[PDB]
Design a protein around this ligand. Structure first.
Ligand SMILES: [Cl-]
Ligand SMILES: [Zn+2]
Ligand SMILES: [Zn+2]
Ligand SMILES: [Zn+2]
Ligand SMILES: [Zn+2]
Ligand SMILES: [Zn+2]
Lengths: 397, 49, 396, 396, 396, 133
């Protein structure tokens, strides 16, 4: 990986810095690194791609070194360097593609493609140079088993799920009490509804609780909390839990009461926020507990009083919402997010060549299945393929 | 390590420490002068070497 | 552009690295490159401005070289370098502004301002050095005629359009069947509504379809699909198509049925997802086809049955929605997006100096008009001005 | 700060570049800078902590210089360098944490920790080298009184406030007219409601206005305008102004009419957008003025006319929305935003070690209270802690 | 940990190999390693802490080397070696005990005692030699990010739980249908009971299902499957779910029908066994799904027909059971098992010295709570203490 | 384009002016330009592409220089010149056809075919001469 990243980094630097008219002093060390790469790769045969529709490519390296007598780079120097760079970039792209389409249940963090296995020899370690990217940095730290960190904007940490729980119900579904939620991506929208508006409740308070268990620990998280859940604030017809029938939901939104957001690690309270809306910080957590109360307004205007009768039928159903958005966070494990394209890159490569389903990843890289069952082996393979995807993106993108 | 210092030839750190009076320990087989003069101890000649 | 970028990068590196106390070993190559820039630019006369309210400015270059014998930089070295850095930064900013406010139809990719045209001469290529930024990298790839690529977080690919289509309508607008949508930025909300709740439909199922054509091909796109359109889920009063009257919409939301999202390239299916929500990947596409269904519930509770009568009047109107949000994408062509600020920079520079509308961009740099009619000429000019904007942003 | 940043960047470059098998030519300058840092730091005693639960830690530097290799680095070199790198990284992280948990009403931009005060001495200026990060660049510019710039994606500029104003009301709350808004983070969602649907309003037009005063000037801002405010588009029960009673809101959404977004700076109109939705550019502003209108539709279908009678009761209340989203902007002062983790890091460090509330920041580093009262002293302290947080993020 | 293991292994080898009359060639390398350890440890001061009732102990090393010039070892050599070996063994045992009684939440895998932290310095790396034991080998492989596993005979993977689920019940508890189970250590017993013997069930079949979610993934597991649960095969009086009353269970055992045992990893069926009993292999799994059916015997002799009437009362209740024993398995993480003494050793050391309850492990090192909430921090601390316990067990 | 036009112009001038019996003074500059073109194109491999039904064609250039030292051009000179000119004319026609059938939305003024892109290299600028059309 370090050698593959070093190849890609050297090629990107060569493309960016070996330009017409530039002083040789600007590229002297880069030229030496490029020549070291040429020397190390020369005389080696590589083969990439025998899985799915990925074609078998054979790679031979017999290239001359770049000159070092110039004081300023001219057109011909740049053209020869660009030809060599183009061949090397094609090779690196194919190696990355071959590595991204493979997975191992045993040692998924180790190289899978024979090209990367060959590059993992001692003779190629000379190609290794500056590992400054975030993903390669985390790769090296994880190899040494130091504390890693991946910064995500809108981390995709909640597997998609839209469901409801009925604490009070009956076959007519005209007097219901429960919660409905959507946990998708970086967003949780929850809403507790009472059809009776807590008319017969213990002090006219109905307590609702939602527990979301993250499959990985998030640290240093900025979270936007908003009182209302707009997803569960319009009339709906919802199929029953058994699917036998359908019930009607007609929410009238009341502000949530005694809102409490609890961020817990290993069942231990790390952060607590009471009646706090806007931007909050969850420094270290793996579970979110949102507890909110529907409180019947003691005083009602004639219209509000008309909404909530003392007994059935209940045509307007009281609802109190909550929206949680993890704007950004840090996680020791790789994750899909709105900013990076690693998951998109791996999925695109796999689909473009119709890679058969392996024994590790979901049936097609479905992120919901992956994050739902984010196993240690899945984590290892996912980190490997994401690092390869970033290496490829340095050049192909 | 005086052997490593001799081999490298880089006296930047040792020179910086000697100039700035930074306590140090020079390690290596060294010949030494046995001085029995108390006046030499008062004169602090051991620091002038 | 490569020379202008190299000037900007050299000046940025001079600002960052030429600091008090730093070893000369840390800036040796940078000082050499800075002196090369001084040598190349010396004896040259440039002129910027003369368009709109942008003032006409004249630039002369007669600067001494920086020292090279220091071991650690001191205050005097930093001030001496800073004088020249300030002058050069002002020159670069003015050249970038002058270029940002100009456009051409046939050859909009080529430099427009006489300053940048002069900088395109061979003798200035000596200033050229490291081109590592994303925009300059793509500029060089385009010039070499290689494949380009721009990463966009929430790409601004869909021009704003809030519209509707009524496949079944009457003058009284009491039994309506159709679909209403908003395509804004990276977001597509659609909602198909049937006022009769598909009671008289062939299979008690009403089929809704929405086709959105992207003006550029997006690749490696990550999208989030959700089964409800919150935008069209509350009651509203909507003008008629010709504005002659207004009709009433009173949605009651049912889950969409047989959801199928298809990402097409040149009319050919590239990706297809059925009954799949959450995160999906569209690897390469320029069109989106969202097909969903409204299925009348075979079994209903008394309240649900009360909602949907056998015949008119239809006071509650069944609706099924879809939300499709593109979070990230890669495009060969420049686009506005949330994270970057090139569109804002170009628009700000054009507005601040009251640039008369040109023959290429829409008046006021309005993005919706730009992306609705995103022609190759507009793409050329937009890439040029965006690259210049990024170069300027390196300094300003 | 510059010295601490230089230490942190030297150590990050040491981690990234001193790797097994790498050419010595790839790290020659880096090794020279690292050895200079070792020379400068050796023989100095530093103390960190002593505030809250942050432990008191003593740091002594007695490290030998990194060696040289003829051609390539080997494993022995890497381990020997890594020991020193680990110690220095621990020291830098501890110093950054010590500096993040401190504040001062007077001279908040100056170092507050003993370690950073010592590092600001002349003897350590040798360590200073390349200052290329955005935060350190802005720090250096602000030290020189030059124009600063921070680019934010979804800037956290609006303190949370879900409020309403009733321009027409009465104790029965059955014929109301006013506006309700949510200003949260980078988002404004306003909605003007009229229960009478402007039946008696002159010209059948009701004018709604919302003025939002940003606490800092935003430049080069990309803004998304959408006609409808989904937050205030569904029925709800809202407390009274004084909380003595609850009233009922039953929106029916109409297209906002004569929409006008004015972006103003110091009371002067800078940008105007009339009936323009989608992406717009606010080049320089500190005030947003959204003026829209509810226009009674002159023609109504029977279903629409049934909702808007000539007189009371008004069961359905007309509402016109407006959504404004700052996707990205540039501000001269540090702010929280969706993309960065500076606020999160500082808050986490303060919470973890139970730092008692100081005389500058609000308890718990709550952002709403901080941005509500964003004083210049608070700006200085927050910029200092944010810069230290970025310096620490380089390593940790 | 590697240096501590090396000390322990050197001392164990010295005890086993330094015997009277043995050729020095049999211990040449062992004596070289012993002298290397003496040289490395000489002149160092160690302290084993006072946590709990464990006494504070100070250790000094000023030992001379062992002779290397005898053809055969004699009584003098053995006595002289033993005098040093006793002190070193005492030091190693005390260090191991000090490390076993400590836990950390942030970094539970790093050494906790100051003695082991001192031994983790570079200067002691010379003591390191052969690491052949399973636990130290796994420690090193896991430090290398390599796939390693512990082999367990009767792994203690199932937290103790005796519970029942009543899918059909009533206040009088006379017509019940449900499941009873005990999951203890490596053993699962389940029994689905129907009081009516599926007289009214669709097609006279009642389906029972039991899902056991392992807290860690097991590989290459040998499992004995037997068609009856003797634990739930006799009359019982069982508390109710809320403990309000007690109900009567009077099983009459029928053969389980349509037995399907599935071993699943990430929700996918890795292994399936239908109507197979005896030894089966679960190659890789983290969930066990046992499905079985109570089938009413179509033909019954008069004695059998007397047991199952058409209606209540039901005095004989038809039960079908399964037993699943994990004879052997392999796990990435450490576990208690019937063969190894690591858990017993750690618990004994914690109990003997009255170590207070820490933040990681449950009180008294209770294995049910430990394996129930098997957090990553608990896994790290447990692996560390188990490795130390094995190291100590080499000597004590 | 200028290089392709210059190739076509040189070939047309050679066809019109290299005729039997003509004085060498009438073709001296033409012969020099023709030899310059031969030297520039010699050793270069070209390929006209297979877009549509246009056949994939491969072109190799290894030709001798047109002779000097004739007071009046004879039939042998015209024969050799005609052979070389015919091969070059076929090449130029195929390159022109390959370029005529290609288009790009952006940078449509630049050469599209690989042959014309190769001819746009600096090493072929020598072939360029009078651009009078
Ligand atoms: Cl966003
Ligand atoms: Zn974003
Ligand atoms: Zn139900
Ligand atoms: Zn109409
Ligand atoms: Zn009021
Ligand atoms: Zn019971």
């Amino acid at each position: 990986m370090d050698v593959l990243y070093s190849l890609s980094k050297t090629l990107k630097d060569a493309r960016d810095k070996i330009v017409e008219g530039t002083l040789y002093s600007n590229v002297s060390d880069l030229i030496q690194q490029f020549n070291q790469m040429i020397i190390t790769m020369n005389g080696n045969e590589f083969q990439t791609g025998g899985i799915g529709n990925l074609p078998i490519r054979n790679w031979n390296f017999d290239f001359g070194l770049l000159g070092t007598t110039l004081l300023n780079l001219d057109a011909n120097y740049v053209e020869t360097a660009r030809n060599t760079i183009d061949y090397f970039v094609d090779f690196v792209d194919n190696v990355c593609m071959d590595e991204m389409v493979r997975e191992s249940q045993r040692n998924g963090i180790a190289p899978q493609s024979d090209s990367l296995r060959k590059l993992s020899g001692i003779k190629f370690k000379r190609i290794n140079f500056d590992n400054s990217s975030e993903y390669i940095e985390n790769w090296n730290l994880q190899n040494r088993r130091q504390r890693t960190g991946f910064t995500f904007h809108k981390p995709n940490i909640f597997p998609y799920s839209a469901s409801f729980t009925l604490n009070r119900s009956q076959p007519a579904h005209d007097n219901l009490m429960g919660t409905m939620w959507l946990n998708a991506g970086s967003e949780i929208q929850v809403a507790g509804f009472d059809y009776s508006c807590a008319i017969n409740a213990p002090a006219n308070i109905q307590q609702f609780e939602h527990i979301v268990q993250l499959r990985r620990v998030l640290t240093t998280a900025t979270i936007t909390l908003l009182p209302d859940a707009e997803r569960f604030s319009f009339p709906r017809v919802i199929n029953s839990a058994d699917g036998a029938t359908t019930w009607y939901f007609n929410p009238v939104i009341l502000r949530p009461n005694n809102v409490e957001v609890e961020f817990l690690l290993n069942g231990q309270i790390i952060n607590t926020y009471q009646a706090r809306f806007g931007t909050i910080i969850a420094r270290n957590f793996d579970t979110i507990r949102l507890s909110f109360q529907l409180m019947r307004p003691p005083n009602m205007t004639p219209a509000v009083a008309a909404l909530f009768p003392n007994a059935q039928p209940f045509e307007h159903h009281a609802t109190v919402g909550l929206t949680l958005r993890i704007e950004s966070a840090v996680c020791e494990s790789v994750l899909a997010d709105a900013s990076k394209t690693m998951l998109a890159n791996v999925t695109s490569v796999r689909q473009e060549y119709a890679i058969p389903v392996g024994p590790v990843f979901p049936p097609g890289m479905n992120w919901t299945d992956l994050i739902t069952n984010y196993s240690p082996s899945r984590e290892d393979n996912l980190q490997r393929v994401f690092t390869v995807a970033s290496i490829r993106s340095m050049l192909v993108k | 390590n005086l052997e490593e210092l001799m081999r490298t030839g880089d006296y930047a750190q040792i020179t910086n420490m000697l100039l700035n009076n930074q306590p140090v320990a020079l390690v290596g087989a060294l010949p030494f002068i046995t001085d029995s003069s108390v006046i030499s101890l008062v004169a602090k000649l051991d620091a002038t070497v």
